[PDB]
């Protein structure tokens, strides 16, 4: 416990960094699925502009 | 039963006025009958056992053959009238030697035989209604040497009218007796 | 090992104790049949070698209708089958049925069970009776009881958590007859008397807590929590421990001013606990408001004469001293010359427990207080006016002279309350 006490702050920072990265990556992959969907309002506006 | 019960001054079994008087007594009818009919003198209901045979028709207060009622009270008191037909009643006791003795009082004897287990004895009733007060704690002090601890079963055979079979801690007088335990 | 005996006489007593005796089962690990799964239980429950724990309480009612809810409900394996003394016919708002001819039958049985329980406790510390002023059996059976119990045992302490009739609302007609007669008993053969009422617990049940339609199963749980706070130091550990004479000597100055109020401080919902900070300084200050009296009076128009407290939970006494100094500084709270301290504190090291289905949150800090105040004489004035306005035309007195009670004891308890109301102001005046 005392040997690993010297690095207590780095794991605390690493967990926040990992959770923020995973959340934002989930947002981006769901945006990929949303942009591949076809019955959206703005996508229908783009097809009507076409 | 009756171990945890307080067992104070007057403890009662088998009131004739009840929704179920004979709920704890086990009855064995054999050339006889049991009912609940009105006496024409005290003018309230009594029980009724009859039969040609004295010995086979009876009711016994512990229904379970193994079980016994533990009553520490000295005197057993009944309210039974005289009918000029044969009639018996029996108890057991327990004494300080941890033995179970007997005391039968039947209508048709003249010899009391002091004996190890069964001390048969006579009685003589009066002409009308009467109550019987039994004096247990001198019968087992005189006939048997021992003293009184318990009274374990009671059993009454043929040809009587039954109402109010109750235990006592002493001999009460008629004025000292309460309103319900009187006769009339 | 520091035991108590708690009797519940009447209907209201038995129905409060029905809500008292699972809070004790939930403070400890005692599940309802009597088998703890995994001796701070000692004051309330005896233990029996098959694992089975049995209560120390007697339940009496002269009618069998309410005890037969318990006898086949959820708590039938818990109680001993002679802690439950029953009858056939009630007393029916008459004091004479209960204290006289028909009520002299079960008193030998209730005294046998008091003797048979009190003869097995190693250390005996006193009595907690729960009897209703409003009853016909709950106020006559207990007056038949206490006059014989105090001849038998004598010096041990008597505390009664009784139900005072509210000043406006009331649910019977001969309450001014049945209230006045039992205070010929409780002045001489009793040593404390904590009263509560029913309208103010509805008040404090709807304003501090979002309950529409409040009932008796809401009254009886708070009055069970009050007694579990007063019986905390005999069962637990902490900084200052107050025992069942260490407050009941503090609380009775004169031998006829022994009528103190009670107040429980944290009463709040499950939602709005997050928004109040719930500090020692604010829940000490909640005790001294006029809104938070379980008994309907204003203490401001009177004077607190002597007080007490019963803390619990995560307190440290610097906060309590800083609270008490502010309470002494304030001027909503007025005192008398003959008690310049006017305080008494116990502590404990245990939080409140949350019975499931109760509408209270898991607060940590908890306060009770128990006040000898002279402003209960106003409520006794309001029930004082009710008596002679019915004895003037001699109403209902045949129902009392029928079941063995003479007429003159109405005048005797009249002048008894007259002397008591003479005593409160004569000991509340300054010198």
């Amino acid at each position: 416990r005392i040997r690993d006490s010297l690095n207590r702050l780095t794991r605390e920072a690493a967990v926040l960094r990992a959770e923020r990265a995973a959340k934002k990556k989930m947002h981006v992959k769901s945006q990929e699925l949303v942009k591949h969907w076809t019955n959206t309002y703005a996508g229908m506006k783009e097809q009507k502009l076409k | 039963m009756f171990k945890n019960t307080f067992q104070s001054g007057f403890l009662s079994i088998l009131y004739s006025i009840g929704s179920k008087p004979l709920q704890i007594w086990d009855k064995k009818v054999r050339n006889g009958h049991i009912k609940r009919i009105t006496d024409n003198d005290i003018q309230s209901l009594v029980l009724e056992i009859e039969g040609t045979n004295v010995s086979t028709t009876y009711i016994t207060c512990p229904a379970d053959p193994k079980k016994t009622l533990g009553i520490k009270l000295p005197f057993l008191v009944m309210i039974i009238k005289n009918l000029k037909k044969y009639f018996t009643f029996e108890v057991q006791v327990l004494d300080d030697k941890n033995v179970r003795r007997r005391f039968r009082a039947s209508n048709y004897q003249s010899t009391t035989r002091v004996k190890p287990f069964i001390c048969t004895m006579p009685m003589r009733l009066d002409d009308g209604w009467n109550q019987i007060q039994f004096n247990l704690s001198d019968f087992t002090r005189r006939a048997y040497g021992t003293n009184y601890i318990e009274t374990l079963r009671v059993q009454i055979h043929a040809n009587c009218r039954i109402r109010r079979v109750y235990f006592s801690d002493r001999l009460y007088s008629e004025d000292e007796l309460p309103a319900e335990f009187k006769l009339y | 090992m520091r035991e108590c005996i708690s009797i519940h006489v009447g209907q209201a007593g038995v129905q409060i104790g029905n809500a008292c005796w699972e809070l004790y089962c939930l403070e400890h690990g005692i599940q309802p049949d009597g088998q703890m799964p995994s001796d701070s239980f000692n004051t309330f429950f005896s233990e029996t070698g098959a694992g089975k724990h049995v209560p120390r309480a007697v339940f009496v009612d002269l009618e069998p209708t309410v005890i037969d809810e318990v006898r086949t409900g959820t708590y039938r394996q818990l109680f001993h089958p002679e802690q439950l003394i029953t009858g056939k016919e009630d007393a029916a708002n008459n004091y004479a049925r209960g204290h006289y001819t028909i009520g002299k039958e079960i008193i030998d049985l209730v005294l046998d069970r008091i003797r048979k329980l009190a003869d097995q406790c190693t250390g005996l510390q006193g009595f907690l009776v729960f009897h209703s002023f409003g009853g016909g059996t709950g106020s006559g059976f207990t007056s038949l009881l206490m006059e014989r119990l105090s001849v038998d045992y004598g010096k041990k302490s008597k505390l009664e958590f009784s139900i005072y009739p509210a000043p406006q609302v009331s649910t019977a007609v001969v309450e001014p007859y049945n209230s006045i007669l039992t205070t010929h008993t409780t002045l001489e053969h009793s040593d404390c008397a904590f009263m509560v009422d029913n309208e103010a617990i509805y008040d404090i049940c709807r304003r501090n807590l979002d309950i529409e339609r409040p009932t008796y199963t809401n009254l009886n749980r708070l009055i069970g929590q009050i007694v579990s706070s007063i019986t905390a130091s005999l069962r637990f550990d902490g900084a200052l421990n107050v025992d069942l004479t260490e407050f009941q000597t503090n609380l009775v100055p004169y031998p006829r001013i022994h009528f103190p109020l009670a107040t429980y401080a944290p009463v709040i919902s499950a939602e709005k606990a997050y928004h109040e900070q719930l500090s020692v300084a604010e829940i000490t200050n909640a005790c001294f408001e006029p809104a938070n009296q379980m008994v309907k009076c204003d203490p401001r128009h009177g004077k607190y004469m002597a007080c007490c407290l019963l803390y619990r939970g995560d307190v440290v006494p610097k906060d309590v001293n800083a609270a008490i100094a502010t309470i002494k500084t304030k001027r909503t709270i007025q005192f008398v010359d003959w008690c310049p301290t006017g305080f008494k504190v116990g502590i404990n090291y245990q939080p409140p427990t949350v019975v499931p289905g109760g509408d209270l949150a898991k607060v940590q800090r908890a306060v009770c207080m128990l006040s000898n105040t002279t402003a209960i004489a106003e409520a006794w004035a309001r029930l004082d006016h009710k008596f002679d306005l019915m004895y003037a035309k001699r109403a209902f007195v045949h129902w009392y002279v029928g079941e063995g009670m003479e007429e003159g004891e109405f005048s005797e308890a009249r002048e008894d309350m007259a002397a008591l109301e003479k005593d409160y102001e004569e000991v509340g005046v300054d010198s």
């Binding site: - | - | 709807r206 304003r207 979002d210 529409e212 339609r213 009932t215 199963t217 289905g357």
Partner: protein, 79 residues
């Protein structure tokens, strides 16, 4: 099982000496080896609807209240 003649004549004789009268030897000694859906569960305590204790539900469908009871001195009263 049998270890001798005594336990042969008494281990399984099946001959009451009291009741069997005027018998024979072979009728004395006779052992017994000569002679030879939809399933369901029922709750024990028949409960009652009327004797339940969880709450007293409002007469008005107080999700969208029908006769407005506010909390005394401002705000929602129910749930």
């Amino acid at each position: 099982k049998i270890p001798k003649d005594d336990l042969d004549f008494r281990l399984a004789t099946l001959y009451n000496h009291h009741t069997g009268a005027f018998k024979n030897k072979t009728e004395i000694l006779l052992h017994q080896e000569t002679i030879e859906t939809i399933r369901h569960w029922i709750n024990p305590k028949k409960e009652s609807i009327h004797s339940i204790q969880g709450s007293i539900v409002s007469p008005h469908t107080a999700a969208t209240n029908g006769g407005y009871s506010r909390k005394n001195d401002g705000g929602f009263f129910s749930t």
